[PDB]
């Protein structure tokens, strides 16, 4: 690992702007890696702390890093309800079909947790609504087995 | 009552000789332990869920138990701890005074009632209910030299061969083995399963059904056909015994002939039960045994019991096997019962020298020698009719009551002999008349003193323990004094002591002797002119008082209270902690780094390192270690530099900068946990249904605006472990269903070869020990091997787990905390410089108040009996300051008097507080005690100068500063002789370095100071008390 | 002593007892027949009725008296909340089902299974990663319960 | 009875909004004042006799 | 189960378990062909003999779990004992009809 | 080895600390009469008569 990427991982972490603003600053790699491979933008978009993924993002992160099993930012941002951050990974060139490993898109997890006004945004952006998991599943398939019909209707 | 023995010194004999008999056999079968048990009486549930992760063994089995403490009796909190590790640890804090065996068994009562309700592979783990003694007697290392077996080798031997003897030896409480028993151990082998279309769940079901026991039943059984000639028992399959026998097992017979068996499918070697930990003293393979004394025995008995079990059982170790002492408080112990008994001895040939260099015969200097021993002999039997023990406490409490013994001794002689030559009276109706001025007295100091001590046996919590321990044997002492004061000594004195003719005092005699005499009967007419002259205007010295009064104040709030001093106990720690997801193979190379470390750049005074991987108090795992360090013994460490204070320094220094994690150094605490004086233990609470992550953001919240506040605030920081990436593998039911895969299988296989299983029994040369199944290591390592298991579908196929799975990495807690049932963390932390933890608490209160809607706080440490026990010190001393004021407005027949003794409080405070502060020490419970006597002490000394003062004023007819002249005049000697005693036996204390120096320097300085300050105060000080509160009223 | 030896007694029974019987938690108490007093929950803005006020208590409240000390035994007046799973024997029959599979189900897919860890002791020599592995876990929501795959 | 309100007091700042607690039956408040009853006697007694 | 396994399984188990108790003077064992085991402890002499069975039984609890499965589900007893009978009460049937 | 229990247990304690029973039990005789009569002749005198 690196010296600074040490502690600008755990930063994005607990969400210390000023310290991360710091840590930018001195140069702190940004592309630094815990053993999983989340990188401080990965934390930041699954923590949900906004302005540490901008700054990242200003500073040369790769918006579109992937995990040891081939997780984006992106990914972690539509599966835990984080919006704003889903717009700006998205504006940024975030791959908006990135599949995981498993054939898993942001669109199946947002769908999933039920994150209807991420899901448009998603859409939006051009997600892939027919994209199918390494289970065949879709989108939809998984809104119905949920029961979410709200949801269920957006995706038509 | 003294003229009762005057007259009858035979029966004082007795009296003396009853009580030397008493003590004698006191001190034979009375209590051996370094300190008493002060902390609240506790018991913990532990469980252990192999393969578990933190949230599945709390919301399972931690949360199940802890709805059921419901119903027990005296319990002031509950605390528990869940972690990756698969074990849950609960618990339970009881009321101080309570039984701490009905609490066990009201707390394991309504564990078998939840029982039910816990996991299957739990349930045959077990639950384990035991006493939080918290204090080890000492630790025996076992390791092998011979480089001829690993720690689990040397454990089942120990298990096997060495734990029952220790458990019987005479005197042991408790013992652990750091380790196990061997267990069977079924390492399986994913692509040979395959191979065959077996699973872990073929494998489990083999075994329980050839490692079994079959109940059968008799030949010729009750009830029989008549004419039976034969009754025997029918033995059928019983378990199984050996490693070749399990690897024989049949798992499968194939339709070409062929035979599957178990060791075709994995490897069978006699292993350990776990393997998160491993264990080394200087980098060699180790195991042990804590050893607990057992209630009410002599630790110095036990020490050498086990020594003569072990060395008993020497000759059967095999080759290369040797036990080490790592750890072993009773070379400490003995140490400082020595200690004590010299300083007693010592202060008794002090107290004779002084005593004869004063006196002119050698009659007068033997009955000190006598009254002290048998007050002292009659203390033990005392604390034995207490239940109390011979420990660190309360043998200094004996050192610190000394001077009170001294005195009585020397007081009632030293007036015997100066009334005597004051007058031609004969050594009877001397002593007689003698008595007759201080016997009331007397009775008062005893009251009195018993009135500054008592109050003391009545603080709470674990402090309140503490104090109970000097203020009990400190009164009885006294107590036992003013008895022996009042029925031995008067006797002696009348007895043993020749005449001496009217105004002789020495200053006709021979050589130096004779020269003393002159020039201490001439030093007496000085002192005299200066009290005279000092009471031809007091007010000069009412100023001086306030100065000093004032100064006592300012000096006395700038000393930083402690708790105990720490000492250098041989041994010390040093804590290694890695990042999230630090492998076991990586803290080791920094134990090692560390070992290395005390091996080399500390090989003057290091004995060994044990190196203890995968433990770290405030949280387990392989990120984790700790090396407990043992020391050479203390001749051999000359020099502060050599000292676990300075080792200390200089290794976490040394330390500072290994970059792989933080591994600090450290001395241990006097007794058990933080302790801190300064420190505050602090439970945040989740009081709706916020959970984990949330309360996680309330307590970063909580800590960043603890970090704003260095003033008040200093070192806030959680007690418990951050979130770290984990593997979450999701079943796709429908795919399972599908091809024909059951859920049970999958669940088996999964957490079988990747978690483990235990399966059974099977009986190892003897002793039943388990049979587990797991995965051989290289293929569950990594998310990649998850896909090279199989699991046999209905129709007979075998599905890759990557057919029916998908994973991802997400965050978890690998340690989640709970206090009284609710989801919680812990939090640390101390006041800062120069503030007190009651103002550092006070804070944390109103910064808590600030966070989240349902979110609470609670306090539980040191914290919960200072909220409680918050504080009775004045209320307290009020009393004690209110108790001695009737007394002695008693002994005076004056609402007035009583302020001319009392006075003198600050007098011996203030040196006491100057040696302090000078000396850098602090305001401790030894320096706190310590203060009580010196006041006492002193005390005394005022209430003689008054009584003689006020004696001559009615019954001479006296003027007020005539009086006060001639009392303070016939006072000074005997007062002298004692200071000078006393100062010079505790003045060893004082200088003394290593060994429990720490609390010999306690007690001393704060004692010579105040003495010394007392004494050189009090004869020019008192005088102006009485003169100036007799001119007002 | 009494609660003691009575307790003895009854684990020399327990096992004996239907299996319903004992998950269902037999206790021992110690206590005087009459109520010391009753403390009385109620809602003041009519924003939850007894069913959620009962099942506040039960989940909030009686745990901690329940281990106050004098507390011999507490009686709620209400009922905490469960996970109901109320059946419907035509639509049972329709899917050719029975509350046996439902049973099964539910224990099949409402599950805490442990299941170890990725680089767990003993590791292989030059393992970097350990972490645990978390797979089903407790349902918690009528919502999760509701998609349980039957057939 | 004293224990019991100490900790009800530990939960009400938390409690849901509407949510309160209401004490319908106690035996223990006679206990208390019937005894400071017989006490406040006592005054009176020495009053009286005084 | 057979004296030996019982003795093995159980006896042993429960015995290694039995340290660390207040005033304990000796401790005897017997373990049957029939499976059964019986571990008396005696006290010194002015022993509470109540605060003595819950400390055993508080050390039993540490073995429960190390014990047969069946050994459980036979349940173990920790009782106050004497060796001797007070009185043996018989009863017969003086008009034949009811056999023993 | 060997060992002697239950009834033989007591019997070899029983027979064990008699002499030091008999010992103090003589020796507080002696205390009592001395301290009584204000004498060590005198107590001296009668324990002989034991
Ligand atoms: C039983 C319910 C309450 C009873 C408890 C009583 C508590 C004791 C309070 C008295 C404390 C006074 O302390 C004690 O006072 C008594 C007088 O009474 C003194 O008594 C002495 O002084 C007086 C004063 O000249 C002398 O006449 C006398 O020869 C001598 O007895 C003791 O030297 C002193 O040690
Ligand atoms: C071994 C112990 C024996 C040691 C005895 C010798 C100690 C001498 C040190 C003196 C200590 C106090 O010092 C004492 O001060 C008082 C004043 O307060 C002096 O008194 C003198 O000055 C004061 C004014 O202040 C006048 O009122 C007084 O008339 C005059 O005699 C004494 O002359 C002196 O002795
Ligand atoms: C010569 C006469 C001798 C005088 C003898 C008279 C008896 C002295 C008794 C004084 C009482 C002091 O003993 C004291 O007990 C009281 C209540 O009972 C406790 O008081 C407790 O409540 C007080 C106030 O109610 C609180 O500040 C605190 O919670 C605690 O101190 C003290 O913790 C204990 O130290
Ligand atoms: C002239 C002054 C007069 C003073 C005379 C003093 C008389 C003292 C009489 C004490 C009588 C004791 O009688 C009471 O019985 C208990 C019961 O064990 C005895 O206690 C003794 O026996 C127990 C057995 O139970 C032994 O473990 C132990 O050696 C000891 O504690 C004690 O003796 C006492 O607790
Ligand atoms: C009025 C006077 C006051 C009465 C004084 C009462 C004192 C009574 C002493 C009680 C002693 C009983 O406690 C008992 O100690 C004695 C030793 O003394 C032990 O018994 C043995 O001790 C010694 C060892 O020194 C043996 O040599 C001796 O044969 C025997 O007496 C017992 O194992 C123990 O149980
Ligand atoms: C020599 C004398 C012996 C010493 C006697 C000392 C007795 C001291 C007891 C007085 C302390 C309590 O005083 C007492 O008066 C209160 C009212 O004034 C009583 O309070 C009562 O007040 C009303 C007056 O009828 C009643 O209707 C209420 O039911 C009740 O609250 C309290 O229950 C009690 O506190």
């Not at chain 2, 077996?149 to 013992?175: C, F, P, W």
């Not at chain 2, 108040?849 to 307290?876: C, F, H």
């Amino acid at each position: 690992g690196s010296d600074l990427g040490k502690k600008l991982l755990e930063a994005a972490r607990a969400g210390r702007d000023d310290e991360v603003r710091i840590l930018m600053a001195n140069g702190a790699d940004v592309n630094a890696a815990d053993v999983v491979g989340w990188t401080p933008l990965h934390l930041a978009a699954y923590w949900g702390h906004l302005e540490i993924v901008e700054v990242l993002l200003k500073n040369g992160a790769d918006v579109n890093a992937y995990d040891t099993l081939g997780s984006t930012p992106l990914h972690l941002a539509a599966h835990f309800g984080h919006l704003e951050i889903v717009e700006v990974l998205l504006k940024n060139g975030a791959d908006v079909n990135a599949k995981d490993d498993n054939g898993i898109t942001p669109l199946h997890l947002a769908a999933n947790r039920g994150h209807l006004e991420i899901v448009e945004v998603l859409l939006k952006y051009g997600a892939d609504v027919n994209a199918q998991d390494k289970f065949g599943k879709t989108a939809f398939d998984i809104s119905i087995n949920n029961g979410n019909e709200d949801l269920a209707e957006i995706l038509q | 009552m003294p003229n009762f023995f005057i007259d009858r010194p035979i029966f004082a004999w007795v009296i003396a000789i009853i009580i030397m008999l008493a003590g004698g056999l006191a001190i034979l079968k009375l209590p051996v332990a370094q300190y008493p048990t002060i902390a609240p009486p506790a018991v913990t549930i532990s469980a252990s869920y192999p393969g578990a992760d933190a949230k599945t063994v709390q919301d399972t089995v931690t949360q199940v138990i802890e709805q059921n403490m419901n119903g027990i009796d005296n319990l002031m909190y509950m605390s528990s701890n869940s972690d990756s590790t698969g074990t849950v640890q609960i618990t339970l804090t009881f009321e101080s005074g309570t039984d701490a065996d009905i609490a066990q068994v009201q707390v394991q009562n309504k564990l078998q009632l939840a029982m039910p309700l816990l996991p299957q592979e739990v349930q045959q783990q077990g639950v384990s209910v035991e006493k939080s003694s918290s204090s080890f007697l000492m630790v025996v290392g076992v390791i092998n030299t011979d480089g001829t077996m690993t720690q689990e080798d040397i454990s089942d031997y120990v298990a096997a061969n060495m734990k029952d003897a220790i458990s019987r030896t005479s005197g042991v409480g408790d013992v652990q083995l750091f380790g196990s028993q061997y267990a069977m151990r079924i390492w399986m082998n994913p692509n040979e399963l395959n191979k065959f279309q077996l699973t872990p769940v073929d494998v489990i079901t083999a075994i329980k059904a050839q490692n079994a026991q079959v109940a059968a039943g008799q030949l010729g059984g009750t009830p029989p056909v008549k004419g039976q000639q034969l009754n025997a028992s029918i033995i059928a399959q019983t378990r199984l015994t050996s490693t070749e026998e399990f690897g024989k097992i049949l798992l499968k017979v194939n339709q070409d002939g062929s035979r599957v068996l178990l060791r075709d499918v994995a490897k069978i070697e006699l292993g350990g039960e776990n393997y998160d930990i491993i264990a080394e003293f200087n980098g060699q393979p180790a195991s042990g045994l804590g050893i607990k004394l057992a209630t009410g025995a002599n630790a110095l008995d036990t020490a050498a019991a086990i020594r003569a079990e072990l060395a008993k059982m020497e000759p059967f170790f095999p080759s290369g096997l040797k036990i080490v002492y790592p750890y072993d408080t009773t070379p400490f112990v003995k140490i400082s019962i020595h200690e004590v008994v010299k300083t007693l001895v010592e202060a008794i040939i002090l107290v004779f020298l002084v005593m004869y260099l004063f006196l002119q015969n050698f009659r007068a200097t033997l009955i000190p020698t006598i009254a002290v021993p048998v007050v002292l002999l009659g203390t033990f039997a005392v604390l034995a009719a207490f239940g109390f023990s011979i420990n660190t406490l309360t043998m200094f409490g004996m050192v610190l009551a000394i001077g009170l013994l001294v005195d009585d001794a020397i007081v009632v002689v030293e007036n015997v002999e100066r009334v005597m030559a004051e007058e031609g009276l004969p050594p009877k109706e001397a002593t007689r008349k003698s008595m007759g001025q201080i016997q009331g007295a007397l009775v008062g100091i005893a009251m009195v003193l018993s009135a500054v001590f008592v109050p003391m046996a009545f603080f709470g919590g674990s402090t309140g323990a503490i104090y109970r321990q000097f203020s009990i044997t400190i009164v009885s002492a006294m107590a036992l004094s003013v008895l022996v004061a009042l029925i031995l000594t008067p006797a002696l004195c009348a007895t043993m002591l020749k005449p001496i003719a009217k105004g002789d005092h020495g200053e006709g005699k021979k050589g130096f002797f004779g020269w003393f005499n002159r020039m201490f009967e001439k030093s007496t007419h000085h002192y005299t002119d200066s009290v005279g002259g000092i009471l031809r205007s007091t007010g000069r010295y009412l100023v001086l008082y306030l100065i000093i009064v004032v100064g006592m104040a300012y000096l006395f709030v700038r000393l930083p209270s402690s708790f105990l001093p720490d000492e250098d106990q041989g041994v010390f720690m040093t804590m290694v902690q890695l990042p999230a997801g630090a492998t076991q193979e990586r803290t080791q190379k920094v134990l090692n780094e560390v070992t290395h470390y005390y091996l080399t750049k500390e090989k003057n005074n290091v004995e060994s390192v044990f190196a203890v991987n995968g433990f770290g108090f405030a949280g387990r795992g392989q990120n984790t270690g700790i090396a407990f360090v043992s020391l050479k013994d203390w001749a051999d460490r000359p020099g502060e530099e050599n000292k676990v204070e300075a080792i200390t320094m200089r290794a976490t220094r040394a330390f500072s900068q290994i970059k792989d994690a933080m591994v600090f150094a450290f001395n241990l605490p006097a007794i058990v946990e933080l302790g801190t004086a300064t420190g505050f233990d602090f439970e945040l609470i989740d009081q709706a249904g916020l959970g984990h992550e949330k309360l996680t953001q309330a307590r970063n919240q909580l800590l960043a605006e603890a970090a704003k506040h260095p003033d008040m605030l200093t070192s806030v920081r959680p007690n418990g472990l951050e979130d770290t990436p984990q593997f979450k593998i999701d079943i796709d039911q429908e795919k399972a269903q599908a091809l024909g895969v059951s859920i049970n299988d999958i669940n088996t296989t999964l957490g079988a070869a990747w978690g483990g299983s235990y399966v059974n029994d099977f009986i190892d040369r003897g002793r039943v020990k388990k049979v587990y199944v797991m995965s051989e290591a290289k293929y569950r390592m990594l998310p990649d091997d998850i896909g090279d298991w199989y699991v046999r579908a209905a129709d007979g196929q075998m599905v890759p787990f990557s057919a029916f799975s998908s994973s991802r990495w997400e965050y978890g807690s690998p340690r989640l905390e709970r206090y009284n049932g609710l989801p919680s963390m812990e939090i640390l932390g101390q006041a800062a410089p120069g503030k007190s933890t009651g103002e550092a608490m006070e804070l944390m209160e109103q910064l808590a108040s600030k966070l989240p809607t349902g979110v609470g706080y609670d306090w539980t440490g040191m914290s919960y009996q200072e909220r409680l026990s918050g504080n009775q010190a004045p209320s307290l001393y009020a009393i004690s300051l209110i108790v001695v004021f009737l007394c002695l407005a008693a002994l005076y027949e004056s609402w007035s008097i009583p302020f001319s003794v009392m006075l003198v409080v600050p007098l011996g405070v203030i040196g006491a507080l100057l040696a302090a502060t000078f000396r850098g020490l602090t305001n401790d419970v030894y320096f706190q005690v310590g203060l009580l006597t010196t006041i006492g002490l002193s005390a005394k000394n005022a209430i003689l100068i008054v009584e003689f003062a006020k004696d001559l004023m009615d019954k001479e007819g006296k003027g007020l500063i005539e009086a006060t002249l001639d009392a303070v005049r016939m006072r000074l000697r005997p007062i002298l002789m004692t200071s000078l005693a006393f100062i010079l036996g505790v003045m060893p204390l004082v200088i003394s370095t290593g060994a429990g120096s720490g609390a010999q320097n306690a007690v001393g300085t704060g004692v010579m100071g105040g003495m010394v300050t007392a004494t050189v105060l009090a004869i020019f000080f008192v005088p102006v008390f009485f003169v100036v509160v007799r001119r007002r009223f």
